[PDB]
């Protein structure tokens, strides 16, 4: 009835507590480290199969096969070394908004605008690929799918609810319900023990994959956030927003550490992914280029401009050999 | 290369050919995004013709598709960019909706947001003023002044409907790129699909001549 005032009281206490523990302002501590010079990455390969906008990609743990899901109603599994295609998985629903690749290299999970993260099977008998499951239950739209193991797939729907599924049976084992608006992006931990979901109301929450208690809740953005990725350590994670401000948060400090923003930028972020070292943070913009922000000093270190229309997905391989950007041109480059 | 990589590149070319061929056969069908306010009568027109729902109907040797997305409550501004490159936007409006509550202003404001949106700049907007009979009976009870206070004209169905039509056809800020076609749902005839056809064939001809570099 009146508990809104006590909610305000606790919110002020939180802000006071996380404020009174800030003495660094990371940009101050990083003053000593020499810059990364200037890095320019030449387009090595131009993987061109699609005939419409491509919305996702995910480097299989092989560091070779990437799966790229398009709006043509066909996700194709590329071979990043020889440009060859190995599957053309004709998906039932034309609309696709995400794509995953199970770390074993067996399963690949599509999922689009009709609420059914629908997993596929690659290493099968009979040659062709089948639909193992169709994980229905959501009442919004799938925004990302990510694989824990060949059995467990988390999802990020438009019902404001991230849900962990069980492939074996096809039912929501747990439903994480804390957010206000849409959930536009999701990212697992290198230890797969706790994931973060970037909502659509400028709140990036850290869930626990086991229980389902949102241990922390980060704020700072003014508009929608469209991309999350963990620092490969697993004690920090970027947020890509529509404010154009890719902000590096922290898991233990509980607050924002620094902000990556250039006053000549206006367009929103679509993707963020750290390099293997965690030194340089990539970010896919709507100015048809993906700037490479030094993730220690906030200074831009390069520009990867080879795209006609905006970039939608940006996947960094699991040995830092090569990044890949998925445009709306129907060509996804592989920079190095 | 090698003995295996040759067969791998052969597989690559084979599925690439199949992908391009499906591309052709997919591009052969005209797409029609179906907007409409809550209880605008999407059911009426969707049953008149034949998550997301994809309805495939054919007429006069053209394969149409309608995505009645209205059956979804989420952030519109996040998934609407999935539909740029659609031929037209079939935007049905409940014409009996002038009486209820504000609902007409709601439908008009949705039209305003969908008709001046960044992605739809070139897409010609059809709109169906459906349920004309209930509005036609209703005017004699309550005047159009209920929802349009500025309205100054005759309280006859024929002129009132024309004013409503003109009030919508005014909304578009860009007038030279996207022509707004209009029809009232002839319940006892097949002129609804016929008008959809005439609308789509017009925008196809215009696009196809602009393609030829003459226009």
């Amino acid at each position, epitope marked *: 009835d009146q508990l809104r005032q006590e909610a305000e009281q606790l919110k002020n206490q939180i802000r006071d507590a996380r404020k009174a523990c800030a003495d660094a302002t990371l940009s101050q501590i990083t003053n000593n480290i020499d810059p990364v010079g200037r890095i320019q990455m030449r387009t090595r390969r131009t993987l061109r199969g699609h005939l419409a906008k491509i919305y996702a990609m995910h480097w299989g743990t*092989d560091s*070779r*096969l990437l799966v790229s899901a398009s709006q043509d109603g066909k996700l194709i599994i590329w*071979d990043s070394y*020889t440009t*060859n295609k*190995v*599957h053309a998985i004709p998906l039932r629903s034309s609309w696709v908004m995400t794509c995953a690749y199970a770390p074993s*290299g067996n399963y690949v999970a599509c999922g689009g605008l009709d609420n059914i993260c629908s997993i596929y099977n690659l*290493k099968t*008998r*009979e*040659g*062709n690929v089948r639909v193992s499951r169709e994980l229905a239950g959501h009442t919004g739209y799938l925004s990302c799918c990510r694989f824990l193991d060949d059995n467990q797939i988390v999802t990020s729907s438009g019902d404001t609810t991230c849900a962990l599924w069980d492939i074996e049976t096809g039912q929501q084992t747990t439903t994480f319900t804390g957010h206000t608006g849409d959930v536009m992006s999701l990212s697992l931990a290198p230890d797969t023990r706790l994931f973060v979901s970037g909502a659509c109301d400028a709140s990036a929450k850290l869930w626990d994959v086991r229980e389902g208690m949102c241990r922390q809740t980060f704020t700072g953005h003014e508009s929608d956030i469209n991309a999350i990725c963990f620092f490969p350590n697993g004690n920090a994670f970027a947020t890509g927003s529509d404010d154009a401000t890719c902000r590096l948060f922290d898991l233990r400090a509980d607050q924002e550490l620094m902000t990556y923003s250039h006053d000549n930028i206006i367009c929103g972020i679509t993707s963020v992914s750290f390099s293997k070292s965690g030194r340089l943070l990539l970010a896919g913009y709507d100015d048809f280029n993906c700037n490479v922000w030094d993730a220690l000093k906030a200074d831009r270190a390069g520009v990867l401009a080879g795209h006609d229309n905006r970039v939608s997905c940006l996947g960094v391989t699991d040995d830092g050999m090569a990044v890949a950007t998925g445009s709306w041109d129907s060509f996804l480059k592989i920079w190095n | 290369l*090698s*003995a*295996e*990589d*040759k*067969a*791998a590149v*052969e*597989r690559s*070319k*084979m599925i690439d050919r199949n992908l391009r061929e499906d591309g052709e056969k997919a591009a052969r069908e005209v797409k029609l995004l179906l907007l409409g306010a809550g209880e605008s009568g999407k059911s009426t027109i969707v049953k008149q013709m034949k998550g997301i729902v994809e309805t495939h109907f054919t007429f006069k040797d053209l394969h149409f598709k309608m995505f009645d997305v209205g059956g979804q409550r989420s952030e519109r501004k996040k998934w609407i960019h999935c539909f740029e490159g659609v031929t037209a936007i079939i935007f049905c409006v409940a014409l009996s909706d002038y009486d209820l509550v504000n609902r007409m202003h709601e439908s008009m404001k949705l039209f305003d947001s969908i008709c001046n949106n960044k992605w739809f700049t070139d897409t010609s907007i059809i709109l169906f003023l459906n349920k004309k009979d209930l509005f036609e009976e209703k005017i004699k009870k309550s005047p159009l002044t209920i929802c349009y206070p500025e309205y100054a004209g005759s309280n006859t169905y024929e002129e009132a409907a024309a004013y409503i039509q003109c009030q919508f056809e005014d909304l578009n800020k860009r007038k030279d790129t996207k022509e707004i076609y209009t029809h009232f749902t002839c319940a006892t005839d097949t002129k609804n699909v016929q008008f959809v056809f005439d609308a789509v064939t017009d925008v196809i001809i215009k696009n196809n001549l602009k393609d030829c570099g003459l226009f």
Partner: single-chain antibody
Amino acid sequence: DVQLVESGGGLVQPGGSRKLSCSASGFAFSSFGMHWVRQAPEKGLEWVAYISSGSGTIYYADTVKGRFTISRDDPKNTLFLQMTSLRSEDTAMYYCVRSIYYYGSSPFDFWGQGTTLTVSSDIVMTQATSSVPVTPGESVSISCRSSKSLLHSNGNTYLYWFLQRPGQSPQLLIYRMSNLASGVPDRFSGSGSGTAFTLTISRLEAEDVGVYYCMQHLEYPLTFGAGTKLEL
């Protein structure tokens, strides 16, 4: 399930003709590069013919070059072999085997039951070992020697290992000298380097005896070894 069976065997007088039809059933026939490999009554396997996906590519063994004709019918899921002017040297069983060629695939992963047809610069695989008796429970290492650097520029060595059980059709054990097949016990392992290979089978038991051919796949025509007959 996956099932390869063919028919049209019996005897033919030399200089005659036959059409052997492999009736593939239980998978997608169109996407599978199908092979034809024969076996003389008491000799090792030889490569005969080949058909790729959609008949876009064909090869032949130098022994039957232009003398045979291979052809497939996708919509019916059948593989034909038109053979003319048969010598007395083509008397053998004729297996029709599937092979799917993409990255991380398992070619030759299934072999048909096979039909007998009696009549009245290539790489050579010098499998030096012929017969070694082993007791169930021990570890034994078979040897295969190539005639050419098999570690290709790609980084992988194209050398397969087939086990033929007595009076059966031989299944795949390991592909590309290291990786295990689909549905094989983990006891089997391969190792070695360029131009020197082994199949170090561990804790051998019963229902595991037979002959082990090392089909190098690096170049065409594919050449098998003599085979090592494991006795008890």
